[PDB]
Amino acid sequence: STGSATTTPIDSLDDAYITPVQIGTPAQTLNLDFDTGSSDLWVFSSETTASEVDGQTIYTPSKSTTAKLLSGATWSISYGDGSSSSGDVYTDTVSVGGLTVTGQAVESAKKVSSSFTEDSTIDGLLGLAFSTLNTVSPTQQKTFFDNAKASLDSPVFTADLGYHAPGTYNFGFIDTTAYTGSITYTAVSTKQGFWEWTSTGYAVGSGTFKSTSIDGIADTGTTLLYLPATVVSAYWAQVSGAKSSSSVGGYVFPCSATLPSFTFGVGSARIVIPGDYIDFGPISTGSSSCFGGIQSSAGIGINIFGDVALKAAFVVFNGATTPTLGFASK
């Protein structure tokens, strides 16, 4: 089997991407944030505290004839930005882009933190990291991909995120028309439960490529590109007037600037992020200071190849017995 679904930016800045997912019988379609950095499929629901729902579409398990409460199971997740959610667990039928999994754990939120409530465009998350990170207790549950894998034509999924445009998540096949050149594959460590890999270096604009190992994760659920302070300083030094702002929480730059590209290495291959992909717009409405899309990972404890990086590539998440990651230009 295979599946293919369009993923759409939630706003004009590509702050996140949503993909429609069918849950239950009859189907309830929710727009979920596919997140290769986490491993829970959780949704706003009829059980979510009413004051914490503000415009999201909810899953109502009592209206699904295939939903079954998973007895005694709860979940609770705390993301690296301080946001969180928790609740109970149903199993139900879940379909993405024509690919159907029966018995998928659907984590129904009883509580969500304020930043989820405040984003009416995201109805939940669909985790695509390794199932070792799933938070369901006392019996950990499998991700949608792990449940689908054996049925797929090939045990893979691909992320093709658009810049200011729709894109695609495919399951079970590689669309050879969706990229240019070749796909370069690179080793993955699953030791932290992530799609963790080592980039071979970077360049800023037309500058010389610096060969240096940068360990990080391929994370579709993180908006920005978080890299070591030395690398980020070298990038923003090429933008006149850019500065790290403690009050804002990162590098900012004059909105009138033209940003240089940023290149990262995948083996001997190179992925070029155009400068425009690094502009996240005014820091507050009407400001002429703009937020940068490349930020320091210092004190995160890991480097994160988030959407800013991934949307410059066609990305293969190869879930074979020994997982690997593939990157192609597009």
* Active site residues per annotation: 35, 199
CA angle 12, 14, 16 (to 5 degrees): 125
CA-derived radius of gyration, the chain: 20
Does residue 119 bind ligand TUU (CB under 6 A)? yes
Shortest Cβ distance from residue 302 to ligand TUU (Å)?
11
* Binding characters for ligand TUU, 130-169, by CB under 6 A (x = yes): ----------------------------------------
Nearest to 174 by CA among 164, 163, 183, 162: 183
**Whole-angstrom Cα distance, residue 7 to residue 165?**
9
3-class SS at 117? helix
258 burial type by CB count under 10 A (0-12 exposed, 13-18 middle, 19+ buried): exposed
* Binding characters for ligand TUU, 76-115, by CB under 6 A (x = yes): ---xxx-x-------------------------------x
* Binding characters for ligand TUU, 215-254, by CB under 6 A (x = yes): ------xxx-------------------------------
Give the number of other Cβ atoms within 10 Å of residue 180's Cβ: 9
Q: Do 325 and 318 form a contact (C-beta atoms < 8 A)? A: yes
Give the number of other Cβ atoms within 10 Å of residue 215's Cβ: 12
Shortest Cβ distance from residue 2 to ligand TUU (Å)?
26
Per DSSP, 51 falls in state G
Choice between 222 and 318, CB closer to ligand TUU: 222
Shortest Cβ distance from residue 250 to ligand TUU (Å)?
14
Choice between 33 and 160, CB closer to ligand TUU: 33
Kindly list the residues in this chain that would bind ligand TUU in the complex (CB under 6 A).
Answer: 16, 33, 35, 37-38, 79-81, 83, 115-116, 119, 122, 221-223
